[PDB]
Design a protein around this ligand. Structure first.
Ligand SMILES: CC(C)CC[C@@H](O)[C@](C)(O)[C@H]1CC[C@@]2(O)C3=CC(=O)[C@@H]4C[C@@H](O)[C@@H](O)C[C@]4(C)[C@H]3CC[C@]12C
Ligand SMILES: CCN1C(=O)C=CC1=O
Lengths: 238, 195
């Protein structure tokens, strides 16, 4: 029954704004990706190339979003890098869930090309795709909106990670986004907001597992004689 | 400090784990296959949560049972060598700082146990309803018991991701290898669950 404070409304407005602002790669980058078919490559090599090369842009977008969150500039550079490295994959899972299409049971990429189970399988990434799509489905079933996604992303970014220097400050920043999420959920979900707050916080727990599942590729790739782009390899300690 | 005693302790932890699950309200009324699945999935998180919470009184150590507390030098020999540090840092220290009581620990572990996202369930909706009941109850309890701190519910819930991460450092079911027979884990669970 407790209402949103004006500061919290400003915060949420900023979050929604940033999320919309850094949601898609530039048309230039995408056009550059579609227009480099190297040498007569097969459908598989094409799918893999698109998935990885776009994933690079996705990570860059994640950084752009993170460095604009209130609180982020209060941290030591070391802790910023640590957080980003540790959370980029999870945030990536949320971004992916935001582009899930129920009807086709597929993920719609920024180039409007739908990627299905078979797209990923053909790319060489079949071992994990069902878990990915299942997360997308669960997420969809919760009917999560823009503010909730933004706030969740902020909360994921400011989570406790190994090798933090000022972990307490991170925790303190995270508290604010938690409370904003709780109040938002209280005031803007109908008829009430039974347990949807805790239900949203379970998403974090699942994101740990998914992040592990994303680290757990690239050994699978090496076994298939395939290769992560070096940026991603470094960023995910692979 | 001795091997055999540690083994006895951890085995006892397993038995106690199953006993605890058995007496959580509405759990034993689920189809037994579902109980086996839920316990298999939560096995590590549940154990780790329990002994983390038992380790708060002790300093720089993990209590694994009656008169058996393990420090870093013996951690590997105890079977906890790989998660020792993160357990002390993200769990024990945290449980101590915020004074996590037993009702809250039980709530959290209930939440872990009642995971409707576990694959292969028959009664998934029922499990979800149970988890929801636990959420509501826990929020109520923290709202009443400690009203001075309004961010306590979320702070408790934030230990669940930490538990999942630490539990994942284990590519095996914790302590199971020190049971005596060649009894498979599903058989051990089936036997220990059915009356
Ligand atoms: C190892 C790695 C490369 C695999 C990671 C993969 O499993 C993921 C999680 O499946 C990757 C692959 C493609 C992917 O990067 C995306 C493509 C898009 O076009 C868009 C670009 C950008 O607007 C994002 O907000 C959403 C989306 C859909 C992202 C999400 C994450 C995806 C979907
Ligand atoms: C076998 C290695 N290991 C540990 O040391 C603690 C959990 C585990 O699986």
């Amino acid at each position: 029954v407790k209402p949103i404070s004006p500061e919290q409304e400003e915060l949420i407005h900023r979050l929604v704004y940033f999320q919309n602002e850094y949601e898609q790669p530039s048309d230039e980058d995408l056009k550059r990706i579609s227009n480099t078919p190297s040498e007569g490559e097969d459908q598989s090599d094409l799918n893999f190339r698109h998935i990885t090369e776009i994933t690079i842009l996705t990570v860059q977008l994640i950084v752009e979003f993170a460095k604009r969150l209130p609180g982020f500039d209060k941290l030591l550079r070391e802790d910023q890098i640590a957080l980003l490295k540790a959370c980029s994959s999870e945030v990536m899972m949320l971004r992916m869930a935001r582009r899930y299409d129920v009807g086709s049971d597929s993920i719609l990429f920024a180039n409007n090309q739908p990627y299905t189970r078979d797209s990923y399988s053909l790319a060489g990434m079949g071992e994990t795709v069902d878990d990915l799509l299942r997360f997308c489905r669960q997420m969809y079933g919760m009917k999560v909106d823009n503010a909730e996604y933004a706030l969740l992303t902020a909360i994921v970014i400011f989570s406790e990670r190994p090798s933090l220097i000022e972990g307490w400050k991170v925790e303190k920043i995270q508290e604010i986004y938690l409370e904003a999420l709780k109040v938002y959920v209280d005031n803007r979900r109908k008829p009430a907001s039974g347990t949807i707050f805790a239900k949203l916080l379970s998403v974090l727990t699942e994101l740990r597992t998914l992040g592990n599942l994303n680290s757990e590729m690239c050994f699978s790739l090496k076994l298939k004689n395939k290769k992560l782009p070096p940026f991603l390899a470094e960023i995910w300690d692979v | 400090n001795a091997v055999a005693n540690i083994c006895q302790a951890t085995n006892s932890q397993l038995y106690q784990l199953v006993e605890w699950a058995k007496h959580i309200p509405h759990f034993s009324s689920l189809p037994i296959e579902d109980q086996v699945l839920l316990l298999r999935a939560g096995w590590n998180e549940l154990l780790i949560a329990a002994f983390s919470h038992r380790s708060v009184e002790v300093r720089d150590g993990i209590v694994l049972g009656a008169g058996i507390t393990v420090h870093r030098n013996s951690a590997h020999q105890a079977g906890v060598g790989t998660i020792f540090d993160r357990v002390l840092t993200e769990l024990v220290a945290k449980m101590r700082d915020m004074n996590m009581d037993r009702t809250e620990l039980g709530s959290l572990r209930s939440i872990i146990l009642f995971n409707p996202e576990v694959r292969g369930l028959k009664s998934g909706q029922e499990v979800e309803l149970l988890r929801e009941k636990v959420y509501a109850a826990l929020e109520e309890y923290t709202r009443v018991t400690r009203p001075e701190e309004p961010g306590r519910f979320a702070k408790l819930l934030l230990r669940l991701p930490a538990l999942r991460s630490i539990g994942l450092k284990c590519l095996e079911h914790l302590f199971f290898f020190k049971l005596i027979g060649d009894i498979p884990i599903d058989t051990f669970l089936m036997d220990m669950l059915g009356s």
